[PDB]
Amino acid sequence: VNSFSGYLKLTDNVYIKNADIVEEAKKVKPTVVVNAANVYLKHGGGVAGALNKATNNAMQVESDDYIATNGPLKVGGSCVLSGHNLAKHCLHVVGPNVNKGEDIQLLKSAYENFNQHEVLLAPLLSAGIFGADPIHSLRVCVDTVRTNVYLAVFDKNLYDKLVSSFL
Ligand SMILES: O=C1CCCN1CCSc1ncnc2[nH]cnc12
């Protein structure tokens, strides 16, 4: 038993809810919240910008130190940093950005990072301003992640379409 509430069950291990991931994190305080990161951990907009704003920019400060020490992430890669006031940990995961021409096959590699954590709160990778089809993203998620994932979908219209088109 865990504290996630109001989710529709899609599979044995994947759950989905129309919710603002920032508000959901603040309420559940999950062990892991996933950020839709870029390789530079520049959290300017989309999910990343919202999460960072909710930390009063502490996520960005921590991220800049991480990059100064380690260099950029790989597309399809991840790193674990603090969850600040939102979660114990934040798993920063880089999905391919279609608006940068990045290979959509890297989406599966991106979701594989979730398997290193037993339970996560997450957005759909590569969705939103990353330009991929969220229905495809949900399919790759279901077919790749084996650990327990609670997906937060901000847009009610998108949420309804994702549910209604799910096989
Ligand atoms: O829902 C949507 C519509 C377009 C893309 N997308 C999911 C990524 S954007 C997001 N996802 C979850 N929680 C949030 N809080 C602020 N932004 C978000």
CA distances from 85 to 27, 51, 62 (A): 10, 10, 13
Tell me how far apart the alpha carbons of residues 53 and 51 are, in angstroms, rounded to a whole number.
6
Residue 128: partners with Cβ closer than 8 Å, 6 or more residues away? 36, 46, 47, 134, 154
Spacing, Cα 123 to ligand 1 middle (Å): 7
For each of the domains in the chain, give its residue range(s) and CATH number, in order of start: 8-165 (3.40.220.10)
Check if 62 has its Cβ closer than 6 Å to any atom of ligand 1. no
* Closest to 85 measured CA to CA, from 131, 151, 9, 23: 23
Q: Is 48 helix (H, G, I), strand (E, B) or coil?
A: helix
Check if 94 has its Cβ closer than 6 Å to any atom of ligand 1. no
Spacing, Cα 124 to ligand 1 middle (Å): 8
Residue 24: partners with Cβ closer than 8 Å, 6 or more residues away? 17, 121, 150, 152
Q: Are 153 and 124 in contact (CB under 8 A)?
A: yes
Tell me how far apart the alpha carbons of residues 30 and 100 are, in angstroms, rounded to a whole number.
31
Atom of ligand 1 nearest to the CA of 127: 5
Sequence letter at residue 165: S
* Closest to 92 measured CA to CA, from 69, 118, 60: 60
Q: Are 94 and 73 in contact (CB under 8 A)?
A: yes
Q: What is the rounded (10 degree) CA torsion for 3, 144, 113, 29?
A: -10
Pocket test for ligand 1, best of 16, 18, 21 (most atoms within 8 A of CB): 21
- Taking CA atoms only, the protein residue closest to ligand 1 atom 9 is 47
